[PDB]
Amino acid sequence: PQITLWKRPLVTIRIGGQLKEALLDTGADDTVIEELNLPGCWKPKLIGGXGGFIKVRQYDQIPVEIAGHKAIGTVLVGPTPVNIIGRNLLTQIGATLNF
Amino acid sequence: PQITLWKRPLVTIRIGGQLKEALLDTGADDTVIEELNLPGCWKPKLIGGXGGFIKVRQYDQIPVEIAGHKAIGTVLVGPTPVNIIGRNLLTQIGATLNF
Numbered sequence: 103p104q105i106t107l108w109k110r111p112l113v114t115i116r117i118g119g120q121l122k123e124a125l126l127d128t129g130a131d132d133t134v135i136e137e138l139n140l141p142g143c144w145k146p147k148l149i150g151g152x153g154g155f156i157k158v159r160q161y162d163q164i165p166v167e168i169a170g171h172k173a174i175g176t177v178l179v180g181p182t183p184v185n186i187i188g189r190n191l192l193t194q195i196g197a198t199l200n201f
Numbered sequence: 202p203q204i205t206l207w208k209r210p211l212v213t214i215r216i217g218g219q220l221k222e223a224l225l226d227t228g229a230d231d232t233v234i235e236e237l238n239l240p241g242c243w244k245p246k247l248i249g250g251x252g253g254f255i256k257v258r259q260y261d262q263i264p265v266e267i268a269g270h271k272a273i274g275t276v277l278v279g280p281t282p283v284n285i286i287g288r289n290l291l292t293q294i295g296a297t298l299n300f
């Protein structure tokens with residue numbers, strides 16, 4: 103799709119078998135989802151924004167369907183204010199910025 | 202232009218007479234610039250990401266040239282780690298997300 107930016111670029115994603123809403127975020131290196139459980143093992147990581155740093159769970163090689171486009175990659179889980187799809191998965195679905 | 206997302210989408214902006222590098226952030230409602238003096242009136246604001254909130258100075262009707270495209274709008278000035286161009290200016294330069 104072509105998505106304009108008059109409103110937040112919120113889209114539906116499928117992850118671990120369930121639906122979530124997430125913001126397509128070109129200013130995020132990584133994809134960060136609110137607390138939830140995902141299968142597999144995870145490792146602790148710290149990430150920063152902006153207002154400071156938070157602790158997250160890093161899960162690797164997770165399938166994520168974003169507006170019907172498939173990605174498989176790293177998902178960070180933790181107390182983010184907003185679910186965000188970052189560049190690690192945006193590149194997999196071929197997303198670009200255009201003007 | 203088209204900007205891919207393999208690396209952070211950093212571009213040159215001109216604001217207040219100065220050339221700076223800034224991140225195009227579709228996950229930002231507003232535009233947040235590192236320190237910088239600027240003009241003759243502002244209002245206090247707090248903005249959050251992630252990590253928590255920071256205090257900023259809101260300046261209105263500031264011209265901002267982004268990759269050679271003229272925009273004019275609100276800019277928030279404060280101790281952000283990265284200059285961030287948000288949706289309020291990205292819309293003005295006709296930026297879209299495409300996949």
Ligand SMILES: CCCC[C@@H](CN[C@@H](CCCC)C(=O)N[C@@H](CCC(N)=O)C(=O)N[C@@H](CCCNC(N)=[NH2+])C(N)=O)NC(=O)[C@@H](NC(=O)[C@@H](NC(C)=O)[C@@H](C)O)[C@@H](C)CC
Pocket residue numbers: 127129130131132133134148149150151152182183184186188209224226228229230231232233248249250251282283285287
């Ligand atoms: C989660 C809240 C929504 C997404 C977030 C993404 N902003 C970028 C800005 C760039 C960093 C300062 C971000 O935090 N990116 C992180 C996301 C986490 C991540 N791991 O991907 C990042 O890339 N962090 C890198 C480190 C910074 C790297 N980026 C860079 N150098 N440009 C990381 N590995 O930790 N947006 C925002 O932070 C903006 N917040 C908002 O738009 C809204 N605030 C709230 C709380 O939703 C609005 C109501 O104010 C800020 C700028 C105010 C207008």
